[PDB]
Ligand SMILES: O=P(O)(O)O[C@@H]1[C@@H](OP(=O)(O)O)[C@@H](OP(=O)(O)O)[C@@H](OP(=O)(O)OP(=O)(O)O)[C@H](OP(=O)(O)O)[C@H]1OP(=O)(O)O
């Protein structure tokens with residue numbers, strides 16, 4: 001729908017999501033992408049014009065995409081999808097300047113329940129991963145900005 005909300009500055013699509021952690025904080029909940037069937041990501045989605053805050057969007061998408069209920073325990077701030085040839089400064093190399101694709105507002109959630117039936121339960125897989133596994137999945141998914149969000153969480157990395 002054209003019910004989506006965009007940054008008035010950069011025109012980046014405004015998305016909220018959840019780093020959903022087990023109470024012991026040893027594992028994060030990950031879902032498969034709908035387009036890229038084999039790629040493991042975290043629950044997230046576009047803010048809608050009616051929604052009063054990012055927490056609403058985040059908890060709605062965590063239910064819809066992952067059948068996961070929990071309490072938001074931290075605001076993990078923002079990360080950007082910086083995807084659209086190169087510009088070399090002679091001490092480093094960078095991609096040619098462009099506006100961000102997406103601006104993500106992430107929250108840490110403590111999982112309280114996982115339900116077997118949820119809206120996207122037939123079009124996605126869903127599973128708990130240790131930090132090391134989760135980190136490798138996000139690299140495999142080519143989503144370093146989601147890994148940045150994961151890294152700000154209280155997930156045990158040792
Ligand atoms: O192509 P990507 O990787 O940039 O991401 C995809 C993202 O998929 P992802 O790869 O993040 O898993 C899709 O979401 P999905 O995972 O639910 O299929 C999402 O579709 P959407 O309109 O439902 O938007 P959300 O991703 O719930 O905010 C967007 O897809 P669309 O091309 O079908 O409209 C998004 O695309 P962008 O506009 O580029 O952000």
Ligand SMILES: [Mg+2]
Nearest residue numbers: 043044045065
């Ligand atoms: Mg999504």
